[PDB]
Amino acid sequence: QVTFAKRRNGLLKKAYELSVLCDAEVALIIFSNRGKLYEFCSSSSMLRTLERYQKCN
Amino acid sequence: VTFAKRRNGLLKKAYELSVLCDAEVALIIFSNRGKLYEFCSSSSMLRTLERYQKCN
């Protein structure tokens, strides 16, 4: 997927921007079709954000 | 607020990435008031988070 790198980088960047601009807590997990993991979390740790998520629902 | 705009944009682009590049995507967003928004491309958010935990 020739556009994968571009879209991935764009999404990681915009996730970061949302967290910075709006004081929002953001977690983003991406697996490529080859199974490569890319991720962003705005908080002290991804685990903490996932734990926060589970507590709602 | 431009929170709404950027949020909607991110949710949409996450969807596009999953569809256009056959990628598995999970996205969790808490507003500064603690409102939860989310997108997951798979059958369930839990399954994708479980996949995530299995890596390093």
Numbering used by the authors:
A (entry chain A): 18 to 74
B (entry chain C): 19 to 74
Paper lines:
The MADS transcription factors (TF) are an ancient eukaryotic protein family. The MIKC domains refer to M, for MADS DBD, I for the dimerisation specifying Intervening domain, K for the coiled-coil keratin-like domain involved in dimer and tetramer formation and C for the variable C-terminal domain important for transactivation and higher-order complex formation. Taken together, these data demonstrate that the I domain acts as an integral part of the DNA-binding domain and significantly contributes to the functional identity of the MADS TF.
The first 18 amino acids, which are predicted to have no defined secondary structure, were disordered as were the 17 C-terminal amino acids, and no electron density was interpretable for these portions of the protein in any of the molecules. Each monomer adopts the same secondary and tertiary structure with an N-terminal alpha helix (α1; aa 18–40) and two antiparallel beta strands (β1; aa 44–48 and β2; aa 55–58). C-terminal to the beta strands is a short loop followed by an alpha helix which is contributed by the I domain (α2; aa 63–73). Each SEP3MI monomer dimerises via extensive contacts between the pairs of alpha helices and beta strands from each partner, with dimerisation required for DNA binding. In the structure, all dimers were formed by crystallographic symmetry, with dimerisation burying over 25% of the total surface area of the molecule. The dimer interface includes hydrophobic interactions between residues in the N-terminal DNA-binding alpha helices, Leu28 and Leu35, and pairs of salt bridges between Glu34 and Arg24. The formation of a four-stranded antiparallel beta sheet further stabilises the quaternary structure of SEP3 with interactions bridging the N-terminal DNA-binding helices and the C-terminal I domain helices.
